[PDB]
Amino acid sequence: KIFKPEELRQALMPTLEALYRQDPESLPFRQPVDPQLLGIPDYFDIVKNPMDLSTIKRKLDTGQYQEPWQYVDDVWLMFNNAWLYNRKTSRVYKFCSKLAEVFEQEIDPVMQSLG
Numbered sequence: 671k672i673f674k675p676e677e678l679r680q681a682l683m684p685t686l687e688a689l690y691r692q693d694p695e696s697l698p699f700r701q702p703v704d705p706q707l708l709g710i711p712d713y714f715d716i717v718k719n720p721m722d723l724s725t726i727k728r729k730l731d732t733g734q735y736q737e738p739w740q741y742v743d744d745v746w747l748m749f750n751n752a753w754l755y756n757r758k759t760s761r762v763y764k765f766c767s768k769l770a771e772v773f774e775q776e777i778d779p780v781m782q783s784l785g
């Protein structure tokens with residue numbers, strides 16, 4: 671019912687590492703979207719709440735996820751943002767879908783273990 675921050679981090683960190691391990695698929699996701707650098711100035715006309723792997727990793731490393739579902743919700747925020755902004759035929763959309771497939775495989779045994 672109640673989780674300790676370090677045990678939560680140890681349970682969840684391998685699922686995040688499995689996303690970082692996807693290369694090149696995780697590359698658009700390893701740092702916050704920079705619309706200036708990427709040439710996509712409408713990004714924040716479309717995406718309300720940005721999220722990326724580096725932000726999730728810091729929240730995990732500083733104990734900000736006190737329930738497993740808060741971690742999962744940030745991962746899916748990252749996915750949903752990319753599916754929302756990018757065309758279904760685009761690199762980032764396809765890479766996002768690959769990451770979601772990987773995550774779905776990795777997170778299920780972990781959540782079964784945690785609750």
Ligand SMILES: CCOc1ccc(C(C)=O)cc1NC(=O)c1cc(NC(C)=O)cc(NC(=O)c2ccco2)c1
Binds near residue numbers: 694703709755
């Ligand atoms: C041009 C529009 O870019 C985007 C548009 C939208 C979104 C989102 C998340 O909604 C993300 C991006 N970012 C990328 O596509 C992107 C960014 C970086 N690195 C940096 C630091 O920006 C690297 C790569 N490299 C490869 O994907 C790659 C390399 C080799 C094979 O594949 C791609």
